[PDB]
Amino acid sequence: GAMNSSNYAELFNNDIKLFVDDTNVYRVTVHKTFEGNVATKAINGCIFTLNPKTGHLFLKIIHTSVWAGQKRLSQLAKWKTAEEVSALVRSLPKEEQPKQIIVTRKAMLDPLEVHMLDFPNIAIRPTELRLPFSAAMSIDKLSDVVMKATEPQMVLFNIYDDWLDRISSYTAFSRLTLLLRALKTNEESAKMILLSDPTITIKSYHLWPSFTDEQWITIESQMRDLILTEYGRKYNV
Amino acid sequence: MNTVPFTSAPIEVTIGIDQYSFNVKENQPFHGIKDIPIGHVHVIHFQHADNSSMRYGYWFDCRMGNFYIQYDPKDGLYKMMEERDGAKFENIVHNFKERQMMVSYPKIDEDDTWYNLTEFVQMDKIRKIVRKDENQFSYVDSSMTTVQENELSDPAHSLNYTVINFKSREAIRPGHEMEDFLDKSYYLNTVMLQGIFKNSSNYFGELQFAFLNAMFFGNYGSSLQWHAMIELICSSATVPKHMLDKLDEILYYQIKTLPEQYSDILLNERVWNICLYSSFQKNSLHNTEKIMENKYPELL
Ligand SMILES: O=C(NCCc1cccs1)c1cccnc1
């Protein structure tokens, strides 16, 4: 059934699972036409598919050409996502295929269920968590590869960098979700917090700065402050 | 006109013949039902006074033999049976008519209700859904489950309706996932109509049989089947025109006949709102939509 706060530790057991988020697949800018009407211009997207135990981010870039001449693009987008997840599973050796795929929006269940009829033993599940994966386009390197793509293209990163060498999946997922939630709530302040100190660098294959343990604690504390504050500024408290 | 005599009425029972019904008191002198119109299927059903649980009855066609009802005190139900001795049967029926111990099938001459609710229902097809080939009549009751319900437990006593499942490999062509799921014309026209049912009369015949079993016996799985077969049509962008015009009539009469107080359990809010207001065929069921909105505007 649905994934919620009560069965949260299942994410970190040894059953392979993926999270799939489709928020950023179909993206537009809205602008005025010469005649004073409004039109959209699509920009590149991505499917955010993530193994929460290993940190593997299978990032599938969606190039604007995929929409050309199509109607009902918000609905097509959900199916286009399901088609790509399905192709990804089929590309993986059997022992690497997920036993469960958890979709972050309920509108994805039927498109993915239908694309995965070939895989009756893969459970397709929703969640009651309000996960901040839509903020993934606030991660500079992810946004850069998405925006520069001139064709469809799959890119790979470990969203946990090398963290698992020192911390558990559980803690690594909790850090990731705190960083994303902060980037979603106040992007500028979140980024200032991460990059203020020029001496902490981001390695070439990594997405986040190379913080020591003590520095991650400071950072984590500063993101929690941010999220509590903006929640006052937003609700005046 | 034909006759279904009864040996006796040993227990108090509400007897139904098609859309009509009447109360028989324990050991009342009742010897059966006369003037049954030839040329249609019929259903004679029972609800005991002591146990409103278990409605049951018998689908039959008087052209396929001489049938009678006889209470069985071991199994405790009114059983349909066939008499093969045609002379014995006529003699018995004549005796009972002379003494006037039979109720008359009470058809009004303006009334085509039963015809319109059974137009495509044929005994030979009923017998394939209700597997019991040693009898020319078919027993149904409230508790019998469907072949798809047993997939989701006794196979001999099930209803073998045609399995319809919108999220199945049969319904969905590789490479047309979104196309085939949002627009079920492939599945209706090629898989089901050309492939399984062969024509729209047989399709409509299962649909009508499913509806009647739902109404008369409160059979939950028949109710599911009836809604399924409606939804498949309504969710197909491409449907022969004659089938839509007939579907509208079919449903019109089913809605007209449904007991007003049973609407809450026999009608699925989601299916009907989808069919009447969101589906490809939302503008195609003028008679059905008009009676639905005037009789059950609550459901919508
Ligand atoms: O391919 C990489 N890691 C192998 C495991 C993965 C599978 C799927 C995604 S990662 C990789 C690439 C770039 C940065 N760190 C690691």
Output A24-31 pairs: Cβ under 8 A, ≥24 positions apart.
A24/A48, A24/A134, A24/A136, A24/A137, A24/A146, A25/A62, A25/A77, A25/A80, A25/A81, A26/A62, A26/A67, A26/A73, A26/A74, A26/A76, A26/A77
Q: Do B110 and B226 fall into the same domain?
A: no
Question: Residue B51 corresponds to which tokens in the numbers above?
Answer: 């146990």
Q: Do B97 and B166 fall into the same domain?
A: no
Q: How far is CA A220 from CA A53, A138, A170, A215, B228, in A?
A: 20, 17, 15, 8, 53
By alpha-carbon position, which residue is closest to atom 14 of ligand 1?
A157
| Contact (CB, 8 A) for B71 and B77 | yes
Q: Do B148 and B134 fall into the same domain?
A: no
Domain around B95? 1-143
**Nearest alpha carbon to residue B218 among B144, B122, B286, B151:** B144
Shortest CA distance from A75: residue in chain B: B178
Minimal Cα–Cα distance from A52 to chain B, Å?
Answer: 28
Are B178 and A76 an interchain contact pair (Cβ–Cβ within 8 Å)?
Answer: yes
**3-state SS, one letter per residue, for B72-139:** ECCCCEEEEEEECCHHHHHHHHHHHHHCCCCEECCCCCCCCHHHHHHCCCCHHHHHHHCCCCCCCCEE
**Nearest alpha carbon to residue B114 among B203, B17, B223, B33:** B17
Q: Which residue has the tokens 């397709």?
A: A124
Shortest CA distance from B165: residue in chain A: A114
Minimal Cα–Cα distance from A117 to chain B, Å?
Answer: 7
CA–CA dist B134, B126 (Å, integer): 14
The reported resolution of this PDB entry, expressed in Å, is 1.7
Q: Domain locations in chain A?
A: 9-163, 164-237
Technique of determination? X-ray
Residue A128: other Cβ atoms inside 10 A: 11
β-strands B138-141, A153-158: how paired?
Answer: unpaired
- Specify the 3-state DSSP secondary structure of A138: helix
Last residue of a domain, one of B143, B178, B208: B143
CA–CA dist A63, A148 (Å, integer): 10
Q: Do B269 and B177 fall into the same domain?
A: yes
CA–CA dist A144, A137 (Å, integer): 9
Query: Which chain B residues are Cβ-neighbours of A110 within 8 angstroms?
Result: 167, 181
Q: How many domains does chain B have?
A: 2
CATH class of A9-163: alpha beta
Q: Do B158 and B137 fall into the same domain?
A: no
CA–CA dist B230, B236 (Å, integer): 10
Rg value, chain A, Cα: 19
Sign of CA dihedral B36, B41, B44, B45: negative
Are B177 and A83 an interchain contact pair (Cβ–Cβ within 8 Å)?
Answer: yes
Q: What angle do CA A172, A139, A21 make, to 5 degrees?
A: 70
Pick from A51, A141, A157 the residue to mutate for probing ligand 1's pocket: most ligand atoms within 8 Å of its CB.
A157
- Cα–ligand 1 centroid distance for A82 (angstroms): 22
At B172, phi and psi to the nearest 5? -125, 120
Question: Residue B85 corresponds to which tokens in the numbers above?
Answer: 């001795």
Last residue of a domain, one of B94, B109, B143: B143
Q: What angle do CA A7, A13, A14 make, to 5 degrees?
A: 145
Are A111 and B172 an interchain contact pair (Cβ–Cβ within 8 Å)?
Answer: no
- The tally of CA atoms less than 13 A away on the side-chain side of residue A75 is 8
Shortest CA distance from A119: residue in chain B: B169
Ligand 1 nearest atom to the CA of residue A206, by list position: 14
Fold of A164-237: Acyl-CoA Binding Protein (1.20.80)
